[PDB]
Design a protein around this ligand. Structure first.
Ligand SMILES: [Zn+2]
Lengths: 106, 39, 99, 253, 252, 25
């Protein structure tokens, strides 16, 4: 248990350092290959889908809605970089939320 | 995409010594002798 | 003896685990692709019929951005090799020898 | 040792990026690095691409030789200086919280034992968790002690070590303390087995730890996360993004 | 005798002024070394500190100091391999070389400690190799490989352009914990940078030179402020033979 | 049972190559 916990610490740190993966962090890559062999692709269609997944990476954002304007309903969406863009700022958008101990530059 | 850093409040559940126990209990239940190689 | 940490009566309806293992990848894929299994990376590549290595390397350098360039390609190859048998190539082989 | 070079180098990168984060920050002078890290952190690959003819992009200029290179400072870029800033800002923030939580010549455990006893059962559990988390470091770096808001009932005062300097603001955590596990620390310890002469720092700093200061920190966070302008701004952003979603979904009819 | 004389001590042309204290203290040490070495061989494991092919009595000449290199080698790498043999001995990946632990517990959280240990271990091995006590003039099969890549209406200073790029990415790494390798990407060269927790085999590249820009790697020799002087000095003690004969098998 | 594993998976691979032409063309 001791060693398994010390790795379970580094198994958190490397994850939050970004370049390390897990089951629901690579399960989408299992899905990538799944549908690439399901609905066949050509190379340039692959580059189009890759630019699609780079536009759904650093700007795609959650809380997507749809109409059934008479009736509308909204629920949350898959991850991105922009959900980090919004979780780094207390979800406030104003990066000066840390009113506590911090050095200042004037 | 599914960014790694985001799912964290679960990745310290591990390094919390509460889930260390709740999974080492399973590992100990599993280290025993078993007589079934497949289903 | 039943090896260590290898669960016997593990199903697919049994919830998915978290450990990056060959067994874990293979069973998660069994859920995911339904029934596709490749005897190597290159069975998958003959199925994809013209998707080179870089054609997935760029896809994944995009998909997860904190990865570096060649590291995207590495995740590519590694998930292949882990749902397959590892590959016989002068790349891996010169890695082994030099190392 | 920071006022030697980093506190002397940062103020020359702050005035040049404060333009490019005007939509984030139009303030001016009163920017704590706790704002530079948060906005000038998420260093983009397609949004903050390298601006054409960038020398720390064309691998002709070292990213560390920017704040002296005026030729870059004239026509700068966003990421090509957002990272340099996201490193030096974070470094000085680590050293700040460091001297602030280390000044433990005063023997004052407070109703801080009450907090931690609620969270563990015993405060030795806490000193042990905190020494384990810094010794079990995937890298010679900085450990942090922070506050979380999703279980803040009893299970709050949560430690985590982070990469070389990435401070637990970039994941939206409220740092309460630091520990110096960097190689500059371990080489100082050497001057007197690594798995031992970093426990010689884990369970050494968790005693040189000025917990009073950190109690001011905990009540600072217990005031921020327990005030009302927090609900205000959060409901504001939760309506802003919801409207930006609805308008976009009602586009191509 | 070499097999008994303890693992760090140094026999001498004994002075014959060997006092009783002079002798009794060194025996007390040797008896300490004896039990720590009967302790090493049960703290020990699969991997070991790669021996180096050259003397390091003093410093690796005109590059590094005796004390500085003994720091890295004796403590930090011994640390790396010791935690690697803490971590791999006893997990489903036990006892196949770094070249297979890296690659089969690579890019993974649930074995993150494992992969970090593995990669850093190798890294140290390769820096060790890539050094040499008085430097190797870049060979003729190699210099032309670098002409084909970094010759832009240029003169004999093309390997100097590559040294330029070396120093450049040394300093464009900032965390002061990591590794800068000149590699061969399977298509072209590129001085890649390296965190603590990665290696050119996690990066699938052919390591051709190994630089160690860890803050601790030069803290004692010049300090953090002499990193440019170090990234220069490293080339009076790099091994372009190792580089080039790896590059040739890399190509074909 | 060993042959049963082998049968199940080869007929799943047959199904996959069937779904290939049935889904893309
Ligand atoms: Zn640039």
């Amino acid at each position: 248990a001791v060693k398994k916990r010390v790795a379970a610490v580094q198994a958190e740190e490397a994850k939050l350092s970004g370049r390390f993966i897990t089951m629901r962090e690579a399960t989408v890559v299992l899905n990538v290959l799944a549908q690439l062999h399901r609905e066949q692709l050509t190379p340039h269609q692959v580059t189009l889908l890759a630019r699609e997944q780079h536009q759904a990476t650093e700007k795609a954002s959650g809380l997507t809605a749809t109409v059934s304007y008479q009736v509308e309903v909204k629920h949350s969406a898959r991850d991105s970089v922009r959900q980090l863009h919004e979780k780094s700022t207390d979800d406030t958008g104003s990066p000066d939320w840390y009113t506590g101990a911090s050095p200042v530059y004037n | 995409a599914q960014l790694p850093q985001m799912d964290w409040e679960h990745m310290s559940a591990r390094s919390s010594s509460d889930a260390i126990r709740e999974e080492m209990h399973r590992l100990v239940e599993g280290d025993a002798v078993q007589h079934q190689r497949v289903f | 003896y039943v090896p260590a940490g290898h669960n016997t009566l593990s199903s697919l309806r049994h919830e998915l685990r978290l450990e990056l293992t060959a067994q874990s990848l293979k069973e998660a894929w069994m859920r995911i692709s339904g029934g596709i299994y490749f005897q190597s990376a290159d069975d998958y590549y003959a199925s994809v019929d013209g998707l080179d290595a870089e054609q997935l390397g760029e896809v994944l350098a995009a998909l997860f951005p904190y990865l570096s360039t060649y590291e995207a390609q590495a995740l590519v190859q590694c998930t292949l090799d882990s749902i397959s048998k590892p590959m016989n190539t002068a790349s891996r082989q010169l890695s082994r020898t030099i190392t | 040792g920071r006022a030697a070079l980093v506190a002397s180098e940062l103020q020359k990168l702050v005035p040049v990026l404060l333009p490019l984060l005007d939509p984030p920050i139009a303030k001016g002078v009163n920017v704590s690095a706790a704002q530079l890290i948060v906005a000038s952190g998420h260093t983009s690959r397609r949004n903050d691409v390298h601006l054409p003819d960038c020398p720390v992009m064309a691998h002709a200029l070292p990213l560390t030789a920017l704040a002296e290179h005026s030729a870059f400072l004239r026509h700068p870029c966003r990421a090509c200086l957002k990272r340099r800033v996201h490193f030096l800002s974070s470094e000085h923030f680590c050293m700040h919280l460091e001297e602030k939580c280390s000044q433990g010549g005063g023997g004052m455990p407070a109703e801080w034992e009450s907090i931690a006893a609620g969270q563990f059962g015993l405060f030795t559990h806490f000193t042990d968790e905190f020494v384990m988390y810094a010794t079990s470091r995937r890298e010679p770096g900085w450990t942090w002690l922070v506050y979380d808001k999703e279980r803040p009932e009893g299970h709050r005062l949560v430690v985590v070590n982070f990469p070389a300097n990435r401070v637990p603001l970039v994941l939206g955590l409220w740092p309460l303390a630091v520990i110096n596990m960097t190689e500059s620390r371990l080489l100082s310890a050497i001057g007197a087995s690594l798995s031992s002469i970093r426990a010689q720092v884990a369970q050494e700093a968790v005693l040189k730890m000025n917990w009073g200061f950190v109690l001011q920190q905990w009540k600072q966070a217990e005031s921020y996360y327990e005030s009302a302008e927090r609900e205000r701004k959060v409901q504001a952003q939760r309506t802003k993004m919801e409207r930006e979603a609805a308008l976009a979904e009602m586009s191509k009819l | 005798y070499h097999a008994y004389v303890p693992k760090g001590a140094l026999l001498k042309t004994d002075m014959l002024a060997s006092s009783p204290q002079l002798v009794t203290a060194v025996f007390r040490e040797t008896e300490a070394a004896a039990e720590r070495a009967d302790r090493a061989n049960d703290y020990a494991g699969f991997f070991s500190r790669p021996r180096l092919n050259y003397p390091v009595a003093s410093g690796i000449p005109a590059f590094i100091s005796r004390r500085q290199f003994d720091v890295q080698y004796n403590i930090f790498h011994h640390d790396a391999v010791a935690t690697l043999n803490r971590h791999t001995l006893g997990t489903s990946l036990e006892g196949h070389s770094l070249e297979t632990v890296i690659r089969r517990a690579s890019f993974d959280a649930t074995q993150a400690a494992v992969h970090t240990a593995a990669a850093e271990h190798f890294n140290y091995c390769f820096f060790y190799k890539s050094l040499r006590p008085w430097g190797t003039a870049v060979p003729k099969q190699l210099r032309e490989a670098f002409q084909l890549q970094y010759g832009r209406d240029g003169s004999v200073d093309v390997v100097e352009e590559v040294k330029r790029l070396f120093t450049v990415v040394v300093l464009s790494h900032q965390e002061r914990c990591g590794w800068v390798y000149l590699v061969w990407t399977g298509k072209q060269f590129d001085v890649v940078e390296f965190p603590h927790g990665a290696c050119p085999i996690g990066s699938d590249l052919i390591p051709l030179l190994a630089i160690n820009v860890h803050e601790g790697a030069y803290s004692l020799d010049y300090g953090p402020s002499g990193l440019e002087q170090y990234a220069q000095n490293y080339f009076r003690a790099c091994n372009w033979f190792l580089a080039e004969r790896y590059y040739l098998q890399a190509t074909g | 049972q060993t042959d049963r594993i082998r049968r199940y998976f080869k007929e799943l691979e047959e199904l996959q190559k069937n779904a290939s032409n049935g889904a893309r063309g």
